[PDB]
Amino acid sequence: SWEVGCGAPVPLVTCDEQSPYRTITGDCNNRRSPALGAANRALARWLPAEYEDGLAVPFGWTQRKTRNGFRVPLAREVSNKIVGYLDEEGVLDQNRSLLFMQWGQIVDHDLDFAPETELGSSEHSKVQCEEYCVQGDECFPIMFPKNDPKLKTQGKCMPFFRAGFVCPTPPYQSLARDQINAVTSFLDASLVYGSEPSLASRLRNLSSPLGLMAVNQEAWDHGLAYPPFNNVKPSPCEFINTTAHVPCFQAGDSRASEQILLATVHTLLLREHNRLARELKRLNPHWDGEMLYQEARKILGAFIQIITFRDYLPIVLGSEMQKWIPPYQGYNNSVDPRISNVFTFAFRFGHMEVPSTVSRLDENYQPWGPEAELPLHTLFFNTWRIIKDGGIDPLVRGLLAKNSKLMNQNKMVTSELRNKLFQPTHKVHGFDLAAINLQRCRDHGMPGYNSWRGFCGLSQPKTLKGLQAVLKNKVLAKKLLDLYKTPDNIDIWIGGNAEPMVERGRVGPLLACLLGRQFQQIRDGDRFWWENPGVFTEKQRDSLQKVSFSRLICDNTHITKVPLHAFQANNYPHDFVDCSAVDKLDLSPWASREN
Numbered sequence: 001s002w003e004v005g006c007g008a009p010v011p012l013v014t015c016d017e018q019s020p021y022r023t024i025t026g027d028c029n030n031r032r033s034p035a036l037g038a039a040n041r042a043l044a045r046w047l048p049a050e051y052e053d054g055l056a057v058p059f060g061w062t063q064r065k066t067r068n069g070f071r072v073p074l075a076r077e078v079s080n081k082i083v084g085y086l087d088e089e090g091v092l093d094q095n096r097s098l099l100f101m102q103w104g105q106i107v108d109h110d111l112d113f114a115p116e117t118e119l120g121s122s123e124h125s126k127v128q129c130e131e132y133c134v135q136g137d138e139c140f141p142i143m144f145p146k147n148d149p150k151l152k153t154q155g156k157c158m159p160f161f162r163a164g165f166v167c168p169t170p171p172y173q174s175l176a177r178d179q180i181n182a183v184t185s186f187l188d189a190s191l192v193y194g195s196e197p198s199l200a201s202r203l204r205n206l207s208s209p210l211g212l213m214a215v216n217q218e219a220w221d222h223g224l225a226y227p228p229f230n231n232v233k234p235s236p237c238e239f240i241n242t243t244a245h246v247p248c249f250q251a252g253d254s255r256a257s258e259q260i261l262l263a264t265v266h267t268l269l270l271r272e273h274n275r276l277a278r279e280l281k282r283l284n285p286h287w288d289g290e291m292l293y294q295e296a297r298k299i300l301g302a303f304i305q306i307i308t309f310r311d312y313l314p315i316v317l318g319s320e321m322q323k324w325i326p327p328y329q330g331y332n333n334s335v336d337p338r339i340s341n342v343f344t345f346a347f348r349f350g351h352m353e354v355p356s357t358v359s360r361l362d363e364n365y366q367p368w369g370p371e372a373e374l375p376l377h378t379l380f381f382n383t384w385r386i387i388k389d390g391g392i393d394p395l396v397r398g399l400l401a402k403n404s405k406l407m408n409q410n411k412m413v414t415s416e417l418r419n420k421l422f423q424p425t426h427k428v429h430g431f432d433l434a435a436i437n438l439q440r441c442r443d444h445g446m447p448g449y450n451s452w453r454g455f456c457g458l459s460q461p462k463t464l465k466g467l468q469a470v471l472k473n474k475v476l477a478k479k480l481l482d483l484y485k486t487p488d489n490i491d492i493w494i495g496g497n498a499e500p501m502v503e504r505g506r507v508g509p510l511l512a513c514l515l516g517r518q519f520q521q522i523r524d525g526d527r528f529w530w531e532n533p534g535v536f537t538e539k540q541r542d543s544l545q546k547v548s549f550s551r552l553i554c555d556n557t558h559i560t561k562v563p564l565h566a567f568q569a570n571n572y573p574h575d576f577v578d579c580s581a582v583d584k585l586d587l588s589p590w591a592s593r594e595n
């Protein structure tokens with residue numbers, strides 16, 4: 001513990017407190033310590049950072065300094081040697097829908113973002129990074145090992161910039177460098193309304209006191225809306241299809257359009273907002289557009305929070321759920337609702353659930369179109385497919401009917417992601433997320449696998465016979481030790497995901513513990529949590545207890561047949577049923593009798 005903080009977070013804000021609304025920035029959630037949970041501030045450090053210089057230097061950066069007596073293996077090599085796999089045969093989760101994979105990234109984006117640093121624009125310094133792959137300052141290239149096929153096709157490194165950090169943008173001394181978390185730690189739909197007032201505003205429709213969110217002009221989904229277009233260029237969305245010339249979406253989170261399905265749900269969530277703002281004016285026609293806005297925004301929030309804690313997490317967590325998330329017992333102010341720096345690495349167990357393809361299913365859930373099933377790698381920043389081909393409905397059916405990819409040690413991340421990822425400003429569909437995840441753990445200064453085993457009060461294996469036992473996988477261990485000399489150097493992401501999944505869940509014991517407390521801290525520490533008295537009425541809570549993704553789709557698309565359990569893999573037409581048989585959100589409890 002040194003000092004009271006570091007510079008670069010907005011010095012002064014206000015808290016109306018009497019306001020029964022969340023700020024946009026997340027300030028004023030907590031009267032004791034305002035900035036807690038707030039956007040554009042440092043991620044929380046549950047354990048001390050770890051760097052070659054103990055300050056701002058990532059491990060491996062040096063080429064001589066070894067970690068714990070050994071050099072760290074290149075990210076790209078553990079990815080290839082342990083993470084890669086060819087055969088997509090048999091990798092689907094028999095009981096997890098694609099929706100299952102698709103809510104984690106939605107939730108992930110509500111909760112955190114490490115702003116990646118590229119700094120200036122007029123930059124050849126960017127050219128130095130990718131073309132020549134020059135190490136230095138914030139560029140920190142992932143070199144390819146020998147015998148790396150990409151080698152013959154994309155020079156000798158995948159560019160990779162470090163993550164933003166508190167105080168300077170340049171590194172400093174006398175304190176461990178902390179990465180920034182640009183969104184709000186709370187589960188407050190800040191991936192839809194923004195985390196900066198500036199954005200929140202331009203995101204709204206202010207030309208009508210209807211409390212609506214802004215929607216697109218140039219196009220519609222045969223009646224329904226589409227988020228406005230992110231006006232700035234270049235546009236990775238245009239790049240993928242210059243002919244199409246269709247840009248990315250304007251939404252709270254800046255990552256909204258990374259892959260088609262994500263913008264799919266982002267669209268459903270935006271519709272849901274207006275949908276309410278409309279009905280809130282039907283029942284309460286005496287409110288100002290501001291109120292419509294904040295009430296809808298309030299409502300959309302508990303929804304996210306319900307789906308997430310009620311239906312999502314109990315199956316991600318399984319048997320270690322009620323351990324870390326025993327039923328609600330009140331808003332504990334002494335709780336740090338800040339998102340941990342190592343949580344942002346722990347939640348991307350969500351990558352190993354992403355399957356290689358994405359299909360558009362017709363209104364009878366047979367393949368819509370002749371190119372009905374598409375390769376996932378053609379869907380990064382792909383908005384033209386939605387707009388100029390099908391709309392949201394087709395893709396929403398595949399979300400309900402298609403499976404997610406089950407995690408499996410010999411088959412961890414699909415090539416659409418391992419070899420063919422795409423990245424803005426980069427013109428090639430040749431990126432490795434797995435490697436980026438790894439180069440990332442270092443970039444932040446993550447403690448190694450065993451510091452996290454121990455911290456979670458779990459056996460921290462020292463040996464090879466010691467490791468095998470814990471993953472229950474003989475050769476994954478061998479491979480790991482060969483690549484990572486000792487369990488202590490294994491970068492956490494793969495370390496955490498390398499464990500088998502716990503009873504009924506989809507994550508190993510370590511991630512179970514890392515996630516457990518982080519979600520227990522977003523709730524307990526949320527002054528605006530939908531279940532805490534004050535924030536909602538018993539008549540209102542009652543209503544909120546009825547929501548369902550199924551309903552979400554029914555209210556904001558033209559689908560008709562849906563499954564009662566949107567996540568438990570559902571098959572058609574057996575598991576599917578009509579919208580009428582699906583409970584709705586009664587909006588009666590919000591109405592105000594003016595007299």
Ligand code: HEM
Nearest residue numbers: 101104105108112113114259344347348350351354436440
């Ligand atoms: C493409 C990508 C996805 C799907 C096709 C995808 C999916 C997920 C899910 C389902 C997650 C959680 C359940 C999840 C979490 C996080 N991701 Fe990931 N993701 C795709 C692509 C990316 C890319 C690119 C990044 C950037 C990584 C970097 O260091 O540059 C990425 C990150 C994350 C992440 C870290 C978030 C943060 O704190 O900034 C998750 C928690 N994903 N994804």
Ligand SMILES: *[C@@H]1O[C@H](CO)[C@@H](O[C@@H]2O[C@H](CO)[C@@H](O)[C@H](O)[C@H]2NC(C)=O)[C@H](O)[C@H]1NC(C)=O
Nearest residue numbers: 240241242243244245246371378384385388389
């Ligand atoms: C780029 O986007 C354009 C714009 O839609 C696409 O052109 C269409 O693609 C399919 C062809 O199978 C059908 O929509 C039409 O036959 C095409 N129309 C036009 C205007 O050509 C094109 O498919 C995309 N191609 C790339 C580079 O992805």
Ligand SMILES: *[C@@H]1O[C@H](CO)[C@@H](O)[C@H](O)[C@H]1NC(C)=O
Nearest residue numbers: 205207208210212213214215
């Ligand atoms: C704002 O709302 C008005 C009133 O319905 C509507 O005419 C207009 O299209 C909306 N603008 C945006 C950008 O949503």
Ligand SMILES: *[C@@H]1O[C@H](CO)[C@@H](O)[C@H](O)[C@H]1NC(C)=O
Nearest residue numbers: 094095096315565568569570
């Ligand atoms: C899927 O998981 C749920 C858990 O709620 C279970 O009840 C459902 O029956 C399961 N069905 C299948 C197809 O495994």
Ligand SMILES: CCCc1cc(=O)[nH]c(=S)[nH]1
Nearest residue numbers: 105108109113114255258
């Ligand atoms: C580290 C940045 C986080 C991130 C970016 C992105 O584009 N998609 C996802 S899921 N996460």
Ligand SMILES: [Ca+2]
Nearest residue numbers: 110184186190
């Ligand atoms: Ca948030």
